[PDB]
Amino acid sequence: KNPKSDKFKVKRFHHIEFWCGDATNVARRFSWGLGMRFSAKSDLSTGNMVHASYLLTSGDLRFLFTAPYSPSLSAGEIKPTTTASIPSFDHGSCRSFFSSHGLGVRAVAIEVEDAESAFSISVANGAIPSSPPIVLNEAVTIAEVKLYGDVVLRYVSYKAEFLPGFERVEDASSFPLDYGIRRLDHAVGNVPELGPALTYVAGFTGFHQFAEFESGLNSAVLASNDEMVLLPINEPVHGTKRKSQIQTYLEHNEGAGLQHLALMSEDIFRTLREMRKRSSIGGFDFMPSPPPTYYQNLKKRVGDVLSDDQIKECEELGILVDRDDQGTLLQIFTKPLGDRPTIFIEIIQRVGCMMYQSGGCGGFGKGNFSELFKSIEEYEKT
Amino acid sequence: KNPKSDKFKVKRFHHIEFWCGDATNVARRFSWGLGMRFSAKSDLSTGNMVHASYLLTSGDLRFLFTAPYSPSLSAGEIKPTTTASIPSFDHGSCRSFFSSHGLGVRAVAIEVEDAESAFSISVANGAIPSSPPIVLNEAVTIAEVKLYGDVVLRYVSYKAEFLPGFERVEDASSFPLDYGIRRLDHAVGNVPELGPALTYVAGFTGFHQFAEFESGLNSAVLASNDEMVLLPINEPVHGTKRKSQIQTYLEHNEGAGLQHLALMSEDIFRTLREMRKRSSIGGFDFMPSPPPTYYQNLKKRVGDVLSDDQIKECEELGILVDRDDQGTLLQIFTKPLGDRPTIFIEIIQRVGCMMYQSGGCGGFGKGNFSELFKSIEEYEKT
Ligand SMILES: CCCCn1nnc2ccc(C(=O)c3c[nH]n(C)c3=O)c(C)c2c1=O
Ligand SMILES: CCCCn1nnc2ccc(C(=O)c3c[nH]n(C)c3=O)c(C)c2c1=O
Ligand SMILES: [Co+2]
Numbered sequence: 001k002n003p004k005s006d007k008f009k010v011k012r013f014h015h016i017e018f019w020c021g022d023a024t025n026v027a028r029r030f031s032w033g034l035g036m037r038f039s040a041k042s043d044l045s046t047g048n049m050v051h052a053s054y055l056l057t058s059g060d061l062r063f064l065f066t067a068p069y070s071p072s073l074s075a076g077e078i079k080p081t082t083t084a085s086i087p088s089f090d091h092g093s094c095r096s097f098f099s100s101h102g103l104g105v106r107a108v109a110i111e112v113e114d115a116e117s118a119f120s121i122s123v124a125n126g127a128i129p130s131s132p133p134i135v136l137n138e139a140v141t142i143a144e145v146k147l148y149g150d151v152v153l154r155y156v157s158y159k160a161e162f163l164p165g166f167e168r169v170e171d172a173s174s175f176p177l178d179y180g181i182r183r184l185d186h187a188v189g190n191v192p193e194l195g196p197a198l199t200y201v202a203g204f205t206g207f208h209q210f211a212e213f214e215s216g217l218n219s220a221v222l223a224s225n226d227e228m229v230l231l232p233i234n235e236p237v238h239g240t241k242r243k244s245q246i247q248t249y250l251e252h253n254e255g256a257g258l259q260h261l262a263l264m265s266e267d268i269f270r271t272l273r274e275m276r277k278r279s280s281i282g283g284f285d286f287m288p289s290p291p292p293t294y295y296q297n298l299k300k301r302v303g304d305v306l307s308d309d310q311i312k313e314c315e316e317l318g319i320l321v322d323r324d325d326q327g328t329l330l331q332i333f334t335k336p337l338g339d340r341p342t343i344f345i346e347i348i349q350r351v352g353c354m355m356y357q358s359g360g361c362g363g364f365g366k367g368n369f370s371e372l373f374k375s376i377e378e379y380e381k382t
Numbered sequence: 383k384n385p386k387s388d389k390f391k392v393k394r395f396h397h398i399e400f401w402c403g404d405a406t407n408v409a410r411r412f413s414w415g416l417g418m419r420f421s422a423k424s425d426l427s428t429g430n431m432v433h434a435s436y437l438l439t440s441g442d443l444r445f446l447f448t449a450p451y452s453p454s455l456s457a458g459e460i461k462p463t464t465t466a467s468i469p470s471f472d473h474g475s476c477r478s479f480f481s482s483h484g485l486g487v488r489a490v491a492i493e494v495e496d497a498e499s500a501f502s503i504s505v506a507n508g509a510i511p512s513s514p515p516i517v518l519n520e521a522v523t524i525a526e527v528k529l530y531g532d533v534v535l536r537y538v539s540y541k542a543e544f545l546p547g548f549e550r551v552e553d554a555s556s557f558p559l560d561y562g563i564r565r566l567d568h569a570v571g572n573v574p575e576l577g578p579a580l581t582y583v584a585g586f587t588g589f590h591q592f593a594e595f596e597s598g599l600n601s602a603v604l605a606s607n608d609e610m611v612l613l614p615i616n617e618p619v620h621g622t623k624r625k626s627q628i629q630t631y632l633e634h635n636e637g638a639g640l641q642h643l644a645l646m647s648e649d650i651f652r653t654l655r656e657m658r659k660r661s662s663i664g665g666f667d668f669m670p671s672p673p674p675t676y677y678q679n680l681k682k683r684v685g686d687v688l689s690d691d692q693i694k695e696c697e698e699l700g701i702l703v704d705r706d707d708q709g710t711l712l713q714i715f716t717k718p719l720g721d722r723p724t725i726f727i728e729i730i731q732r733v734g735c736m737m738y739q740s741g742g743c744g745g746f747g748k749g750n751f752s753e754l755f756k757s758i759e760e761y762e763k764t
């Protein structure tokens with residue numbers, strides 16, 4: 001059941017912003033590891049004396065990496081005279097965020113019809129304001145409210161390429177990498193208490209709970225009207241045999257924050273081949289592969305969706321498969337993106353729910369907690 | 383003239399330590415960009431609750447990348463009970479260093495006969511102590527004194543692989559990259575006043591001035607007894623037509639610090655081919671190439687050392703050439719390694735001074751300031 005209760009018009013995920021200590025090195029690592037092209041920049045070379053910001057793109061996926069310069073470079077500026085291209089940026093906030101959390105997502109940005117309206121309605125409905133609406137070059141409006149922890153939900157609306165003040169990156173520095181990733185599918189937060197987090201976010205957005213179908217977590221998914229903006233939230237389950245990975249996150253992250261970004265691939269086999277080739281040469285590592293029992297068990301549950309060759313191709317790449325009543329999903333998880341056991345990435349591809357594909361087709365793979373446990377048990381038995 | 387006045391026995395450069403905000407992403411970027419293998423680690427997986435440290439190696443070159451975890455993970459520890467593998471590490475110091483300077487070199491480490499003796503003699507001779515000698519697993523001794531800015535000179539001595547508490551990296555995560563880099567040739571600091579910096583460092587080491595043969599800087603080189611540890615220092619020259627790059631460094635770095643690391647290649651043409659292939663896919667960018675006039679002028683000055691083909695190979699790769707009275711050097715400079723216009727890398731290869739090669743063979747390329755100016759002037763004339 002989808003009551004379509006959005007309190008303002010939401011379009012799609014727009015971008016994800018990481019707050020970094022050095023944006024250059026993180027952006028270069030991510031570019032190579034994920035096959036994203038350098039698309040835009042705002043930094044000293046573009047007149048920004050406040051922050052260095054680099055934009056990577058793959059299809060419609062936009063990853064922004066931002067780090068502060070020395071405050072001394074902009075010490076004469078005031079907000080009316082700022083050279084920052086992202087007016088919500090604050091040196092102190094960014095250094096505090098990174099010192100507290102390490103590398104992670106500061107902003108989950110969604111495109112809306114009217115960012116000022118979205119902000120006003122959100123705050124009138126309980127959202128904690130973070131940065132008021134600001135109009136950039138009479139062309140783009142940006143505003144921010146708190147989502148969870150030190151993560152903000154950023155509203156972007158365009159009158160009519162990324163943001164004013166960003167320059168397109170010259171093609172000589174813009175190598176056209178592409179491993180198949182095309183858009184952000186969902187963005188997941190970890191919180192200490194799921195109930196109040198859901199009540200807060202659903203309260204100010206009107207996002208509705210997205211329907212699904214004893215290992216670590218409780219979770220629920222908030223969704224926009226057309227269910228293309230998907231925001232799952234987890235809480236830990238305490239007093240368990242194996243310690244909750246949600247609790248480990250909260251400890252190493254110093255509290256709530258973004259847990260994982262799920263990136264949709266138009267060809268998950270090509271994406272995983274390309275990413276796995278680069279794991280040990282600057283790219284990203286993946287979770288340990290499930291035992292062959294898991295892939296033996298795949299025939300009985302998805303043998304009508306995937307051929308045997310496609311199933312053995314899943315086995316070569318360590319891909320996981322789950323299934324809804326409407327669709328099937330292929331997914332895999334990276335090891336943490338930085339030093340701390342906190343944020344990671346999921347690669348996903350969905351099969352089914354054609355009309356275009358409806359959002360969330362196949363669910364989020366929660367059936368894979370069960371199947372991974374069973375498959376590991378069966379494999380020890382050999 | 384080399385008076386061989388070292389006040390303690392110095393062997394060779396041992397390692398360079400970068401203080402990072404996220405050691406993982408910087409180390410992965412550097413590994414791919416420079417062709418260095420992941421060799422050792424000290425982090426949560428090895429029992430270190432204090433800092434994440436990753437060691438890259440190429441030949442004898444050792445680059446260490448370190449970042450702090452949340453202090454909460456080690457809040458119960460005291461120095462006697464620390465899980466840090468580098469006892470000089472301090473959360474507050476590291477966060478202050480990185481917030482002040484951005485990504486950069488914290489420690490220039492040299493291997494000595496006896497680190498405790500080196501420390502005592504250094505401090506008795508004016509060195510400002512930074513971390514007292516500490517013996518690790520009765521096997522290695524480490525101590526630190528201030529060098530310039532927030533950079534320390536680190537003494538390491540071994541009784542008899544990197545440091546106790548570091549684990550060798552498993553070969554599955556250790557891809558054997560190698561683009562030809564073999565050792566650290568020199569490490570260069572920028573300071574506001576060269577005179578007092580030289581007096582200080584030469585005062586506590588006994589390092590002697592290394593002999594050489596109107597654009598931005600004054601500099602001098604301090605050298606160990608066999609001139610294998612080479613520490614140049616620059617100061618700005620003010621009131622010039624083009625603003626001093628040394629002054630720009632000091633402004634963006636918030637003061638004195640390490641300017642460039644010069645990495646010796648056993649085959650600079652292979653190194654530059656491999657690095658340039660990767661510039662736009664996660665690696666390092668290089669300075670703009672000199673005009674063809676520079677390479678036309680190369681025949682008249684090094685035509686007896688390099689063939690025409692080797693000279694056109696320099697031209698394809700943007701390599702610079704200078705010459706002493708004893709040797710010739712090939713060199714090239716990267717663009718800055720991170721967000722700020724501060725630290726960069728030089729790749730170098732030296733020809734001549736065989737006996738083994740004596741240190742500093744060919745000088746440091748200061749003749750290239752002159753030749754670059756002339757070559758740019760001649761090229762505008764066409
Ligand atoms: C070695 C680590 C593997 C451990 N594991 N095994 N099976 C999983 C199935 C689905 C999801 C996931 O992505 C979501 C769950 N619920 N929602 C809303 C989601 O997005 C994750 C993260 C895992 C997951 O980590
Ligand atoms: C576009 C930027 C090119 C500008 N430039 N042109 N010619 C150079 C020649 C030598 C050295 C160098 O490495 C040292 C000088 N003195 N000492 C002791 C050194 O190590 C450098 C850094 C340059 C240098 O930057
Ligand atoms: Co997911």
Ligand SMILES: [Co+2]
Pocket residue numbers: 568570642644728746
């Ligand atoms: Co040099």
